[PDB]
Nanobody, 114 residues
């Protein structure tokens, strides 16, 4: 079965930084586009970033552009989300997703607060 496991969340100050990881198994990861989504309380889930199978090109939602970077390691079968210059508005559960199947992990929590 497709399995995605996210980690790396935490509580950080405004302006701070976290690195999220997604460990993928159960599918030919190297040949799949991957995504990160997030869902904040009282809001719908939203796509944060998408990355090509090779890892060379990415698209971002407007609110995170220039601050977040999606990347991947196809040897380790991992996707990463580097979250820099964090803001309270970024507080949410962040989910790794395989768009081919709309597969989701259980998520990791990011809280940005003073």
């Amino acid at each position: 079965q497709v399995q995605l496991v996210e980690t790396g969340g935490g509580l950080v100050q405004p302006g701070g930084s976290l690195r999220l990881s997604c460990t993928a198994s159960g599918f030919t990861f190297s040949m799949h586009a991957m995504t990160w989504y997030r869902q904040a309380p009282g809001k719908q889930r939203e796509l944060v970033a998408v990355i090509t199978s090779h890892g060379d090109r990415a698209n971002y939602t407007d609110s995170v552009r220039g601050r977040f970077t999606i990347s991947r390691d196809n040897t380790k079968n991992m996707v990463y989300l580097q979250m820099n210059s964090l803001k309270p508005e970024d507080t949410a559960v962040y989910y790794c997703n395989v768009p081919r199947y709309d597969s989701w992990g259980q998520g990791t929590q990011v809280t940005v607060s003073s």
